[PDB]
Each structure stands twice: as C-alpha cells, then as structure tokens.
C-alpha cells in the first residue's frame, strides 16, 4: 500500500545507467514506442478540441452538411488512438518480459556460483521473497509505469498548452483545482499511511496469536490455556477493531473526495464558461472542450505521483539485484590440479574454523587418515564433527591451518575433481521432485538403466522401488513425502554409489527408521564403504566397534583418538560418552 | 448434514451502519447525475436566452450539489467502514473461539495450514466484500441504470444507440473472462514451477554442487523460466488488447451520439446542450458498466472464502465432556488400555488393535517400538485428545470419557517430539504449568531438564525473550525447555517421547536420572525406540504394528517378544 520510507539509493544515477544497459539491444524498438505514446497522447488532447469545433462549426450554425467531414476526422483519430494504445502496449509486453527473463537467468546462475555461506546465513524464504519482489518491481515499472508516467506528461502539458491558447481567463478558472487536488490528496495521504501502518502493526500481531495458537493447539489444551489465549486474542482484536476502522476510512475517502473535485471543476467551467459565452467572449463549443479537460487535473495528477514513487522503488530494487550480481563466486585457482587416481588419504594440520569469526568452532584439529580405513567421529552437540564435512568439500575455507587429500592442499585442487572423488550421504538427505530413476541417476549422468537396477539391488533399495505405484518412474512429489525415512536414506545411499567416489563421508540417521529397513541400510552402508576411504559420523554401535580409528571430540577439540578396546581401556571421555550410552 | 450457520448473522448488529452507507451513496449518485442536466439547462436556457441570472443561479447551484455528493460519498465511506470492520472482528473472534474448541480429529479435517489462511486471509477477504457491497455495489449499478433513465428522459429516440453499445461490451467482458481465466491459471502454474526450481536449488545446493551438476539445474531453471515467459506474454496480450478495444467502442458510441444527435437538432427535436448532456451520460454509463465488470470478478473469489469460513463454524468438536462428568481432585496415576483400537483417519489401517496393558501409579514404563508401531498414540490417548474406536482408555480405572477434561488433562503432561513455544519470556513459557509457581520451583525443574545452565547464560536469563513458536531456540533447547515446562505442572502422569532422538549430547541420560528423583509418586511413560532408554524403565511395553508384543522387563522380553529380540538385534 502506502510506502514506508523513501528508498535509500546509494547513488541512483550509477545504478540507473547500468539498468539503462539492459534495454540497449532493443533501443530502436524502444524509440518507436516513445513516439506512439506521444502522438496517442496528443491525439487524446485533440478529441475534446474537435468536439468543440464540431459544436461551433456543425451544430450552432446548423451547417449539418459539414457534419460527416468532422465525424470522419474524429472517427479515425479514435481508431488510431486505440491503434497506438494497442501497439505501445503489445510492443512493451514482449520487450519488458524479455528483460526480466534475463535477470532471472543471471540471478539463478549467481545462485549456482555464490559461496554456500550466503545460503547458510539467511533463511531461504526471506531471500526468494525479497529477490522475486525486487524483480517484479523492475518488470512492472518497465512495462507500464514508465510509459504511463511519460504519457501523462505529454497529455498534461498538451491539454494545458491548448487550453491557454483558446482562452486564458477560463484556463485560470479550471486550473484553480490543481491547488485543491494537491492540498486534499496530501492531507489525506498523510493520515492514510499513518493509520495503514498503525493497523498493519496490530493486525500482524493478531495473526501471530492466530498462527501460533493453531500450530501448537495440542499444547494449548494440554495446559488448559483456552480462556487465557482467548483473552489475549480478545484484547488485540478490540484494538484491531478500532484502528482497522481508522485505517479504512482514510484509505477510501480519496475517490469520493476526488469526485468532489471533478464536479467542482465541471461547475466553474459551466458557471464561468457560460457567463463567458453570454459576453460573446467564448463559444459554446469552447465550453464543451474545457469540460473535456476538467478531469485531466485530478487522478491523472495522482497517477503521476504514485508512478514516480513506483519508479523510485524500482531503482532501489535494481540496486539490490545488481549487488547480488556483483557477489564473488567460487573460483578454482589457475594452478588447481585434477585428482590423480589415489585411494585417498586425508590430513588436517592445526586447523581453526569460525563461522561468525567471533565464536570459534574448531580448534587445532590434527590427524591423518590412511586409505581403506573406517574412522568414527564421536562427541556431543557442538563437538564440531558436523563442521568437518563442509571443510573437506571446501564449501567453507579454513581460517588457520591446512587440509590436504593425498598430499596436495585442498585449496589447490580443482573443486570439480575434488567433489567427484569424494561422495557424501548426510542425515538430512535431499531428493528431487522427479521420477525415482532420475534421482539415482543424478550422481552419474552417463548411467544406464541397468546399472541403476543392478546397483539398486546391492544396496537393498531395488525391492521397495519396484513396489512403488509407478515403479522406477515414480514421481517423488514434494521431495519424497510419501516415503518411509529409511527408504529415503536407502535411496540417497544408492545414488552416492553410482557417483563412484574414492572417499566417502557418511551420516546415517536411526530415528524414524523401522528396524527392518535398519538391517537394510547398515548392510548398504557396508557395500558402499568397501573399496572406499570412509570417515563416518556414526550413531550405531556396529560401526564404532569395527572402526579402524575413533576421534572423540569436544568443544571443537580432539580429546581422544584410538581404537575401541583401547579407548575403553583408557577410560576417558570416550568411556563416559560410551558407558553412559551403551551401558 | 453440513450446517445452518450463516455470515449474515455477523453483520446484523450493525444494520444501522449498513443502511446509512448505501443511502449516503444514493445521495452521491444523484449528486453525480444532476451535473450534466444542469449543464444543458445552463446553455439551452441561459446562454441561448440571455439571462445571466439563470447562468449565475444554476452555476451556484452546481457547486452546492457538488459539495453535497462529497458529504454523501465521504459519509458512505465512514459508515461502510464501521460496518465492514465490526463484522470482521466478530467473524474472526467466532472463528478463533471455534479452533480453540477443536480436537485432533478437527484440526486434521481442514489441514493446519488451511485453518490459518481462513482465520486470516479469508476474514479479510470477507471484510472487503462487505465494504464493497455497502458502497460501490450500490454506486456502480445506480450510476449505470440512473444514467440510462436520464438518457431516455432527455430524449427517448437517441437512446436506441444504447442497444448498440451495451451488448458488444457485455460480450467483450464475458469473452475475456471465459478465455482469460484458464490462461491466468496457466500463469500461476508456471510461477509455481519457477518457485519450485529456485527453492530446491537452495534447499539442495549442497547436493547439486557436490554432484558437479549445477548446469543441469540451469537447464532445469530455463524450462521454468521459458514456461513463465510464454504463459505471461500470452495472458497479458489479451488485456493489452481488450482495454483499447473497450475505449474505442466507448469512443465509437460518442460518434453515434454526435452523428445521430446531429439529425435530431436539425429536425428540431433536440436542443444543442441536451447533446452535450447526453454525451456525458453516455460516458457515465460506459465506465460504470466497466466497474460492474470488475466487481463480479471480485465476488466469485470472495465467494469462495465465505465457504471455507462457513465450514470452520459448521464443524463440530469431536471431543465433548459429558454433562454429568466426574471431577478429579487428585489422580493416583494408574493407566490402563482395555482392547483399544485406534486410527487417525477413517481410511487407513488401525494404528492400534486390541492393545491391552495396565500400569500402576508411579511406574516408569518404557513404551518401546519403531515408528508406526502406534507407540506415539499414547500421547494423544491418555489425555483425551482422541477417543479410540473400540476399547476404553482408563486413568485410575475411570474411563477417560467420563471425567471433566480440565481435571483429567491438568494431571497429565505430555512432551511431544514436535515442540512449540509462545511469544513472551522464557519464564512466562515455563510457568504455563502453574502461574503461582515460584522462581525456585521453576529453577528446580529447569535443572532436572538440563536447561538452567543455558538459560542462565542469557543476558536476561529467565526474563529473556522467546520469539513466535520458539523459532529463536534450537530443537534440543526447545525439547528441554518443553520438558522443564512439563515438570513445573506437577503432573501425575508424564509422557515423554524419546523419539525422534533429537537431540542427545549424553545429557539425555542425565535427564532420565533426575526424573526418577521427582517422578516419586507419579507415573511416567517414555516412548522410545532406543533400547538403553528402555533399560532405565522398571518395565517395557513393546508395541509392534498396533498390537502389544510384550509387557515386562528386558529379560522376560528377550525370551518371548520376537519383536523385542528383533529390535535388540537392530541396535546391538
């Protein structure tokens, strides 16, 4: 509705020019239009002038032979007017719908390139919401409010130029509503915005109480809170009741007030005009023409103010969008090497990592994993074993220290090669709204529809896949909502198989998993891990026993390291972390 | 069958406001329809007759009419605002008071997302529809019809032209509507797909980036983006055509008023000024008609909301307390299930079936099972949140159905796996069990729950600020904050769901240890799928596929209960 505050544009002219570059390849087509609006706007201010003549010429001196000469002049001007409106709109449609097609491409690509940090820091909704609105604001102004503004400038000056060269006295009588219109509109537009917000406050509070109470309804009854919740609602509703009224009056008094200006105009043009015809100073046709300009000084003036603000808000939305297009992207340094076929050894040398750079997350983490070795990562919430994953795929970079796979530092390996030799299954697995086959194929593009079946067989997933309504071609709508969590985990495992990595990071949940699938997924973990280095964030007893190393973690520090029997025999933080679990 | 509840009840106490509105509107329409007539008379009786008095007097008279229509229009906006607002409050309050009495059976019927959108969006949609009816559903049809009557009264013969301007437009409107409506849907379809693509590339950035397949999503986004460019360039090419066509006809009928009006002045039937007037009334009919066009398009949608809002008021509460129900001063805490058969939706398979067990006051039973074994139905059955199809649920060998709910439920605390906190301070949230609870009482239970340390590491500690739904805290912090809030209640039955598993840092075991110390004189169920979680418990109820598999200790169960061996084999 009402705008909150004028946009804080960091040098608009700079962003204006850059914006003025997106519509450079269609300049000729843009200049063609800008003269259509012109002649359509002029032809607009003409018609009330011609009807003045037709009255002065054909009607008053009865010369109705001259009639069809005039009614052919108008009748064609009309037809052209609606011929330009069509073109100066249909042309603008494809042109403006083309500009924002590009920005969608460009934005979405930056999404693919920008650090995983920008995603991790801000909620997903708030970014789509603000981007998609800042794009619509660009589209709307471009394919409407620009030409709607410009047009009304012509039409305004046009209808004024003409108005004065016919008669000045009357011109000063009718333009004496432009002081009224602007005085009214602004008074009324203060109160509206004030109350619009005052209301938007109380009301958003109300929907808070509403959305939150419906979500945790279960919890409201369990505690008997009904009367108390009711009273909390009630107090906010009687509040809303009083403001919503003030907000509603003041936002709907302009049309009736604008009509009042539209009729006061029509009465000075009839009262002075008709008293200027008695003095033989103007003609009746002349009166009819100014009636044709009376309503050209109210809403058209209002459409002018609002379209300006809409442009202004679009310039700011540009500046936001431009900045997203200026974000740095991930680049593989020119020296970056392709991964030589190694069984994959990993080594961290005194690594320190902080997300916010103020609250340290990892401290001096040092170790070395040799090929074919299964390693276990144990520790509480904030242990820092969940942060390891992102540093081995180099989604984030190490503040101090260095990581390296097979000797070579990760920050000097190709991000493309790196992530191919390293596969990954997470607790929060991700599937796609495509068919089943498409999901499993995703890891390996050039996969056959036999390897998919064959590799689905080994990992126990092929069974339930063939029991799904559409079989292997079952669309997983809403990302597998109609699937058992075990089964989803099973599928996510099978697709990491086809990507045939030489290093595998794992993280298998156990919580909404039925025991039956549980036997299946742990068997599949097995077949996935053989012939592969496997660092594991384990939640199972059957993997921390048969592990080849166990790095116990705490406060982002390495408290212990060794095998099962040893770390129990040391009776340290592992022991507590073990015996107060499986004891 | 359905319900006889009707939104007209809510506008009824404000009927004074609802008639003053359209009446103050007819004042405006008349005031608006008088202006062109007084122009013909200005010329056809005053310019063309040399009376300055006439022109002066009917010049003044026009001002006085123009100001009246404002008092009219403003007045009709002040009143229809009072009416539409009051109405909205009242319908919204009744709606909320309905969702407060709903049960789990009800909040499953409408989905919970929908329930909200009705209680918010729809209440405002209807609130608009009322405002609309009371002012421009009176304005637009009077200006239309009134304009025609004036036209005809000016000169019956020229009116014939109305039968050649009015049907082409009404055809234009219907044709657009029947042909535009499926294409704007086709826009929403393609918008959705763009949203979908962009979302999944944010939700799953870490997968597609890892699988070196970003370009497949660029290919996947192009299909969305092109499907959107086409669905819009089409549906908006109609609009961009209809409007200018509409203006032409409106303009082409102007021609028919000057042409045909040129012959009526000749053949001495029609004054010159009455042609001027006639043109104005021609306009006031043609744009008014267009307003009526826009109005209907609003009605059909606003219509849908009135259906959904009516549903929520015609829904009946699935859990009713008997008129002569027993009060429960205290509760010992025995908990028994005779032949309970339970099912959430009347289409699926029984989540429970012939479930039998009994628990003595103060027991610490572990309700072990995998997901789907109906273990988690306990939470919803013991406090009467759902009634079972067959079987009784009993608390203190009383049937649950037979006792006052505020009594029964005030003695049970549940700690569901999905938890919800409410906008205020933490100390306000925790006192949800008892308002008269003292700081020490609150801290006692916060400590057992393993959260007093974290809360106290906050700038304002207990008086720290909780944001809506508990969005500011972590899941595990919500989990324990919910446990601490359960424990302030002094429940006689206490139901915790150790499922899902989130979260544990070892501090889980610390909680169950501290529970023993205060469940002293209180029954406690603990729904888990973890064996070690079931070993602290004095006894283990095992559920498998809705039937009880075994009710006893680890060793007994290790023998018979084939489900329990199988589970035990999965974990160890």
Swiss-Prot record, chain A:
SUPFAM superfamilies: ABC transporter transmembrane region, P-loop containing nucleoside triphosphate hydrolases
GO biological-process terms attached to the record: transmembrane transport
Binding site for ATP: 379-386
A GO term for molecular function: ATP binding
A GO CC term attached to the entry: plasma membrane
Location of the ABC transmembrane type-1 domain: 30-313
Entry's transmembrane regions: 31-51, 71-91, 141-161, 168-188, 264-284
Domain ABC transporter residue range list: 346-580
Entry annotated with the keyword Electron transport: no
InterPro entries per UniProt: AAA+_ATPase, ABC1_TM_dom, ABC1_TM_sf, ABC_transporter-like_ATP-bd, P-loop_NTPase, Type_1_exporter
Family indicated by similarity: Belongs to the ABC transporter superfamily.
Protein name: Uncharacterized ABC transporter ATP-binding protein TM_0288
């Amino acid at each position: 509705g009402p705008i909150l505050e004028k946009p804080a544009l960091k040098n608009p002219t700079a962003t204006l020019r850059r914006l003025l570059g997106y519509l450079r390849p269609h300049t000729f087509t843009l200049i063609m239009v800008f003269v259509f609006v012109t002649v359509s706007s002029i032809l607009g201010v003409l018609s009330p002038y011609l009807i003045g003549k037709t009255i002065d010429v054909v009607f008053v001196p009865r010369r109705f032979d001259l009639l069809p000469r005039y009614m052919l002049i108008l009748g064609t001007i009309y037809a052209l007017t609606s011929l330009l409106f069509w073109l100066q709109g249909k042309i603008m449609l494809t042109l403006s719908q083309d500009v924002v097609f590009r920005l969608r491409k460009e934005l979405f690509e930056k999404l693919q390139r920008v650090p995983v940090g920008f995603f991790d820091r801000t909620p997903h909704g708030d970014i789509i919401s603000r981007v998609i609105n800042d794009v619509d604001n660009i589209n709307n102004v471009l394919g409407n409010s620009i030409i709607q503004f410009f047009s009304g400038i012509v039409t305004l000056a046009g209808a004024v130029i003409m108005m004065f060269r016919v008669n000045v006295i009357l011109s000063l009588v009718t333009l004496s509503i432009v002081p009224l219109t602007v005085l009214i509109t602004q008074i009324v537009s203060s109160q509206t915005r004030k109350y619009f917000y005052e209301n938007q406050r109380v009301l958003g509070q109300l929907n808070g109480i509403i959305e939150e109470d419906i979500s945790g309804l279960t919890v409201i009854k369990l505690f008997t809170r009904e009367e108390k919740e009711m009273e909390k609602f009630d107090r906010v509703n009687e509040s809303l009741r009083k403001v919503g009224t003030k907000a509603q009056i003041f936002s709907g008094v302009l049309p009736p007030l604008m009509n009042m200006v539209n009729n006061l105009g029509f009465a000075l043009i009839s009262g002075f005009g008709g008293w200027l015809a008695l003095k033989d100073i103007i003609t009746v046709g002349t009166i009819a023409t100014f009636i044709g300009y009376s309503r050209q000084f109210t809403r058209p003036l209002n459409e002018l103010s609002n379209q300006f603000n809409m442009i202004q808000m679009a310039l700011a939305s540009a500046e936001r969008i431009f900045e997203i297009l200026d974000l740095e992207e991930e680049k593989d340094d020119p020296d970056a090497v392709e991964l030589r076929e190694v069984r994959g050894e990993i080594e961290f040398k005194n690594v320190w990592f902080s997300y916010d750079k103020k609250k340290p997350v990892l401290k001096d983490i040092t170790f070395h994993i040799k090929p074919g070795q299964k390693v276990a990562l144990v520790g509480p919430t904030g242990s820092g074993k969940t942060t390891i994953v992102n540093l081995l795929m180099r989604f984030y970079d190490v503040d101090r220290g260095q990581i390296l796979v097979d000797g070579i530092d990760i920050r000097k390996i190709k991000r493309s090669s790196l992530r191919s030799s390293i596969g990954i299954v997470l607790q929060d697995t991700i599937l796609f709204s495509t068919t089943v086959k498409e999901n499993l194929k995703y890891g390996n593009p050039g996969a056959t529809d036999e390897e998919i079946k064959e590799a689905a067989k080994l990992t126990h997933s092929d069974h339930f896949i063939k029991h799904l309504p559409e079989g292997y071609e079952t669309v997983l709508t809403d990302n597998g909502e109609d699937l058992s969590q075990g089964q989803r985990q099973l599928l996510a495992i099978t697709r990491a198989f086809l990507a045939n990595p030489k290093i595998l990071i794992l993280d298998e949940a156990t919580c909404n998993v039925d025991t039956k699938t549980e036997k299946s997924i742990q068997a599949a973990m097995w077949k996935l891990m053989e012939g592969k280095t496997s660092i594991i964030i384990a939640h199972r007893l059957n993997t921390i026993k048969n592990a080849d190393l166990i790095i116990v973690l705490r406060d982002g520090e390495i408290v212990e390291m060794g095998k099962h029997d040893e770390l129990i025999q040391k009776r340290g933080f592992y022991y507590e972390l073990f015996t107060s679990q499986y004891g | 069958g359905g319900g006889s509840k009707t939104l007209a009840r809510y506008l009824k106490p404000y009927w004074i406001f609802a008639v003053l509105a359209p009446l103050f509107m007819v004042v405006e329409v008349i005031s608006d329809l008088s202006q062109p007539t007084l122009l013909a008379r200005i010329v056809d009786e005053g310019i063309a007759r040399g009376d300055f008095s006439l022109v002066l007097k009917t010049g003044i008279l026009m001002l006085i009419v123009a100001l009246i229509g404002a008092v009219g229009g403003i007045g009709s906006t002040v009143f229809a605002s009072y009416a539409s607002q009051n109405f909205g409050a009242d319908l919204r309050r009744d709606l909320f008071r309905k969702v407060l009495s709903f049960s789990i059976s009800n909040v499953n019927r409408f989905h919970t997302s929908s329930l909200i959108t009705r209680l918010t969006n729809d209440v405002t949609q209807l609130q608009n529809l009322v405002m609309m009816l009371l002012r421009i559903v009176v304005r637009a049809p009077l200006l239309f019809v009134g304009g025609i009557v004036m036209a005809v009264s000016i000169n019956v013969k020229l009116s014939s032209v109305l039968i050649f301007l009015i049907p082409p437009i009404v055809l234009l409107f219907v044709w657009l509507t029947k042909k535009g409506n499926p294409l704007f849907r086709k826009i929403q379809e393609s918008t959705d797909e763009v949203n979908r693509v962009v979302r999944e590339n944010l939700l799953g950035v870490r997968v597609v980036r890892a699988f070196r397949r970003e370009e497949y999503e660029n290919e996947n986004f192009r299909k969305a983006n092109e499907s959107l460019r086409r669905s819009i360039i089409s549906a908006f090419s109609l609009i961009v055509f209809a409007l200018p066509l509409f203006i032409f006809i409106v303009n082409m009928g102007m021609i028919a008023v000057l042409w045909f009006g040129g012959v009526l002045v000749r053949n001495n039937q029609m004054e010159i000024g009455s042609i001027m007037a006639y043109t104005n009334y021609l306009m006031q009919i043609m744009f008014s008609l267009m307003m009526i066009g826009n109005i209907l398009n609003f009605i059909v949608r606003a219509s849908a909301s009135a259906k959904r809002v009516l549903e929520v008021l015609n829904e009946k509460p699935a859990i009713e307390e008997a008129d002569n129900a027993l009060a429960l001063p205290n509760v010992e805490g025995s908990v028994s299930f005779e032949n309970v058969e339970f099912r959430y939706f009347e289409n699926t398979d029984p989540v429970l079936s012939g479930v039998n067990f009994s628990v003595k006051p103060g027991s610490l039973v572990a309700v072990l099972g995998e997901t789907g074994s109906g273990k988690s139905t306990l939470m919803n059955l013991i406090p009467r949140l759902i009634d079972p199809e067959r079987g009784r649920v009993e608390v203190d060998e009383l049937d649950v159905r037979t006792v006052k709910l505020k009594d029964l439920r005030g003695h049970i605390s549940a700690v569901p796996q999905e938890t919800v906190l409410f906008s205020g301070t933490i100390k306000e949230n925790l006192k949800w069990g008892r308002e008269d609870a003292t700081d020490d009482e609150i801290v006692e239970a916060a400590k057992i729950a393993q959260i007093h340390d974290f809360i106290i590491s906050l700038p304002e500690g207990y008086d720290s600020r909780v944001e809506r739904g508990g969005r500011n805290f972590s899941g595990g912090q919500k989990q324990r904050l919910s446990i601490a809030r359960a424990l302030v209640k002094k429940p006689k039955v206490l139901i915790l769901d150790d499922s899902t598993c989130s979260v544990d840092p070892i501090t889980e075991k610390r909680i169950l240890d501290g529970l023993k110390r205060y469940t002293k004189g209180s029954t406690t169920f603990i729904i888990t799928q973890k064996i070690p979680t079931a070993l602290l418990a004095d006894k283990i109820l095992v559920l498998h596929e809705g039937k009880v598999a075994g009710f006893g200790t680890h060793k007994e169960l290790l023998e018979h209960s084939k489900p329990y061996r199988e589970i035990y084999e999965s974990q160890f």
